[PDB]
Amino acid sequence: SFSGYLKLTDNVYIKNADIVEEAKKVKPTVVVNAANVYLKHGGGVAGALNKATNNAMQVESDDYIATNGPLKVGGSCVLSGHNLAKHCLHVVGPNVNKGEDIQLLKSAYENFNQHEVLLAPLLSAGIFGADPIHSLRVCVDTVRTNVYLAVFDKNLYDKLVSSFL
Numbered sequence: 833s834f835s836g837y838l839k840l841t842d843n844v845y846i847k848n849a850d851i852v853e854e855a856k857k858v859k860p861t862v863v864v865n866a867a868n869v870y871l872k873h874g875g876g877v878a879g880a881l882n883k884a885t886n887n888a889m890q891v892e893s894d895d896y897i898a899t900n901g902p903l904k905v906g907g908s909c910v911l912s913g914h915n916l917a918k919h920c921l922h923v924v925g926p927n928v929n930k931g932e933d934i935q936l937l938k939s940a941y942e943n944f945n946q947h948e949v950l951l952a953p954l955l956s957a958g959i960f961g962a963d964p965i966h967s968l969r970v971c972v973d974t975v976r977t978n979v980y981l982a983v984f985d986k987n988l989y990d991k992l993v994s995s996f997l
């Protein structure tokens with residue numbers, strides 16, 4: 833199971849970890865991807881998860897988009913977890929750098945409630961441009977299922993824990 837996490841609340845845990853390494857170690861039922869509406873896994877968490885699957889995530893994602901069209905910002909889809917997890921829940925948080933509504937971050941986190949336990953990154957953090965302290969707050973106030981957050985950056989992890997109310 834999950835090890836080395838700091839408990840923030842009844843259901844939210846956090847660790848300074850590379851989510852790819854964490855997924856390969858735990859092989860959780862669900863790993864969350866910080867997806868975009870096109871499921872183009874170029875960079876950030878998505879680029880790293882996809883690279884760990886040897887591009888199989890991108891091949892599966894392109895077939896999903898060809899059939900279904902793009903996701904909505906705030907939406908998600910369940911696809912294979914490949915070698916990382918049983919499933920990957922691709923969740924689209926708003927990208928502040930694309931001028932997307934930050935209010936959609938709560939809708940994005942609501943997708944996590946359909947899964948009992950998830951390994952996840954902070955939505956809309958990193959290259960998505962939102963404040964990770966705000967993302968953690970929305971996470972704790974929205975997600976009711978068990979979420980194990982992996983924060984890659986040690987300095988950000990320390991800031992998130994030390995400022996957690």
Ligand SMILES: COc1ccc(C)cc1NC(=O)Nn1cnnc1
Nearest residue numbers: 859860861913914915916917918919
């Ligand atoms: C790479 O991981 C999988 C791949 C395929 C499958 C069918 C399952 C997994 N996961 C897995 O077994 N996770 N788990 C969580 N709690 N007990 C077991």
